[PDB]
Design an enzyme around this catalytic site. Structure first.
Site, PDB file in Angstrom:
ATOM      1  N   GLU A   1     -11.533  -1.558  -3.015  1.00 46.81           N
ATOM      2  CA  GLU A   1     -10.975  -0.890  -2.096  1.00 46.81           C
ATOM      3  C   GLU A   1      -9.871   0.074  -2.554  1.00 46.81           C
ATOM      4  O   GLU A   1      -9.510  -0.241  -3.834  1.00 46.81           O
ATOM      5  CB  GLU A   1     -10.311  -1.725  -0.928  1.00 46.81           C
ATOM      6  CG  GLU A   1      -9.468  -2.765  -1.407  1.00 46.81           C
ATOM      7  CD  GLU A   1      -8.572  -3.364  -0.288  1.00 46.81           C
ATOM      8  OE1 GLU A   1      -9.486  -3.682   0.459  1.00 46.81           O
ATOM      9  OE2 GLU A   1      -7.310  -4.136  -0.652  1.00 46.81           O
TER      10      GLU A   1
ATOM     11  N   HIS B   1       0.387  -2.663  13.598  1.00 47.25           N
ATOM     12  CA  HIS B   1       0.336  -2.449  12.146  1.00 47.25           C
ATOM     13  C   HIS B   1      -0.504  -1.468  11.748  1.00 47.25           C
ATOM     14  O   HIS B   1      -1.808  -1.846  11.734  1.00 47.25           O
ATOM     15  CB  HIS B   1       0.275  -3.713  11.177  1.00 47.25           C
ATOM     16  CG  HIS B   1       1.365  -4.847  11.403  1.00 47.25           C
ATOM     17  ND1 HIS B   1       2.288  -5.007  10.368  1.00 47.25           N
ATOM     18  CD2 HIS B   1       1.684  -5.519  12.615  1.00 47.25           C
ATOM     19  CE1 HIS B   1       3.254  -5.871  10.792  1.00 47.25           C
ATOM     20  NE2 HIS B   1       2.667  -6.304  12.061  1.00 47.25           N
TER      21      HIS B   1
ATOM     22  N   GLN C   1       4.941  -9.140  -1.318  1.00 50.83           N
ATOM     23  CA  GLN C   1       4.841  -7.813  -1.841  1.00 50.83           C
ATOM     24  C   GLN C   1       6.300  -7.163  -2.218  1.00 50.83           C
ATOM     25  O   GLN C   1       6.983  -7.085  -1.241  1.00 50.83           O
ATOM     26  CB  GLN C   1       3.976  -7.132  -0.932  1.00 50.83           C
ATOM     27  CG  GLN C   1       4.494  -7.063   0.405  1.00 50.83           C
ATOM     28  CD  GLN C   1       3.926  -8.166   1.422  1.00 50.83           C
ATOM     29  OE1 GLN C   1       3.421  -9.052   1.027  1.00 50.83           O
ATOM     30  NE2 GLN C   1       3.846  -7.636   2.699  1.00 50.83           N
TER      31      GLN C   1
ATOM     32  N   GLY D   1     -11.030  -8.226   8.639  1.00 50.02           N
ATOM     33  CA  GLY D   1     -12.374  -8.620   8.412  1.00 50.02           C
ATOM     34  C   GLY D   1     -13.458  -8.094   9.029  1.00 50.02           C
ATOM     35  O   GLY D   1     -14.694  -8.463   9.069  1.00 50.02           O
TER      36      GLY D   1
ATOM     37  N   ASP E   1       0.662  -1.167  -0.077  1.00 42.73           N
ATOM     38  CA  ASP E   1      -0.107  -0.049  -0.037  1.00 42.73           C
ATOM     39  C   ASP E   1       0.840   1.393  -0.195  1.00 42.73           C
ATOM     40  O   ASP E   1       0.732   2.088   0.982  1.00 42.73           O
ATOM     41  CB  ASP E   1      -1.129  -0.008   1.200  1.00 42.73           C
ATOM     42  CG  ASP E   1      -1.623  -1.405   1.136  1.00 42.73           C
ATOM     43  OD1 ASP E   1      -2.029  -2.092   0.260  1.00 42.73           O
ATOM     44  OD2 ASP E   1      -1.677  -2.024   2.516  1.00 42.73           O
TER      45      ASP E   1
END
Length: 315
Positions: free
Chosen positions: A189, A60, A284, A83, A6
């Protein structure tokens, strides 16, 4: 390669700063956008209010955004739980990003906005800041539930302007008869809005991140004359009704990618994202892609740059 999730970026003078999902918001620095040294975590530990929004909070912070305003640095960040929509977006401010500067310290301004289960059909994560031509500044945000929202910030950019002015900008199908506390199947998102020419371009991420081999995460795009919408894709479909034109998707080597930012530096445009390296346990990695524009006013990127862009973590 530099592992980030991100990713956002900004430039103070001659040096680039990168911010990533991670403990305290992870900060890296680089004088060339390729070779990255660790700079700081914005928060030493975590925001003082974090645990009362999200009891399970693991330290985090998620999905940062960096915005420059009246000489100050505003770093938005997300407190949340997996979630769930027990989430809030905070903002902390700095006079500078150079850790060895005496003026360097991050001051928390607290909660911009918070989502509450059964009250709100949205999730208060994934901020992106955009200014318009009328001197107003807006925050876009969201993930799953009833999709992505845009609201006007107040004068210090720490809270919604009062009276409040809100706009839905992208959505996927969901019945309200569903349990409000559940994410739903609206896999959308991470809005990001970039002004280019006469249009605002809304990037969003569709599909599922974080899923190793099963990840379907990719980027779609739409565009609008006004920042408040409606954002239409290439076929003319409103993103509020599940429109969105494919910008970039993964391949055998990069399984899933997204949660992007976008910037205009020195008369050139760039796409900043993370992508999961299938040859490295789907970890990532930072990818910066040249952001081009066709003769019809739509962004274009070369997916081969998922390979040719190779960041380096320095010591």
């Amino acid at each position: 390669q530099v592992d980030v999730h991100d990713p956002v970026m900004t430039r103070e003078g001659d040096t680039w700063y990168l911010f990533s999902t991670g403990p305290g918001i992870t900060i890296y620095s680089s004088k060339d956008r390729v070779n990255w040294r660790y700079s700081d975590r914005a928060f030493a530990t975590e925001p003082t209010w974090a645990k009362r929004v999200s009891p399970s909070f693991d330290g985090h912070l998620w999905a940062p955004d960096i915005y420059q305003h009246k000489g100050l640095f505003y770093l938005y960040y997300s407190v949340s739980a997996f979630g769930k929509n027990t989430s809030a977006i905070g903002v902390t401010v700095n006079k500078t990003l150079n850790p060895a500067s005496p003026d360097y310290r991050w001051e928390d301004k607290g909660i911009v906005i918070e989502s509450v289960p059964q009250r709100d059909l949205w999730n208060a994560i994934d901020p992106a800041i955009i200014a318009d031509d009328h001197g107003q500044v807006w925050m876009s945000f969201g993930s799953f539930w009833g999709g992505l929202k845009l609201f006007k910030l107040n004068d210090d950019l720490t809270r919604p302007a009062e009276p409040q002015e809100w706009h839905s900008i992208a959505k996927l199908e969901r019945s309200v008869l569903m349990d409000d506390s559940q994410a739903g199947s609206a896999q959308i998102e991470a809005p990001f809005i970039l002004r280019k020419g006469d249009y605002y371009y809304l990037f969003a991420s569709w599909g599922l991140c974080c899923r190793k081999g099963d990840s379907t995460y990719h980027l779609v795009v739409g565009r609008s004359k006004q920042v408040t919408g409606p954002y239409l894709d290439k076929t003319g479909r409103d993103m509020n009704q599940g429109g969105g034109s494919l910008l970039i998707k993964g391949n055998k080597r990069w399984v899933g990618l997204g949660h992007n930012s976008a910037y205009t530096w020195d008369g050139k445009d760039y796409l900043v994202l993370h992508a999961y390296e299938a040859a490295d346990n789907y970890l990532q990695k930072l990818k910066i892609l040249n952001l081009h524009w066709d003769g019809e006013g739509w962004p274009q990127v070369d997916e081969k740059e998922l390979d040719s862009y190779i960041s380096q973590r320095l010591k």
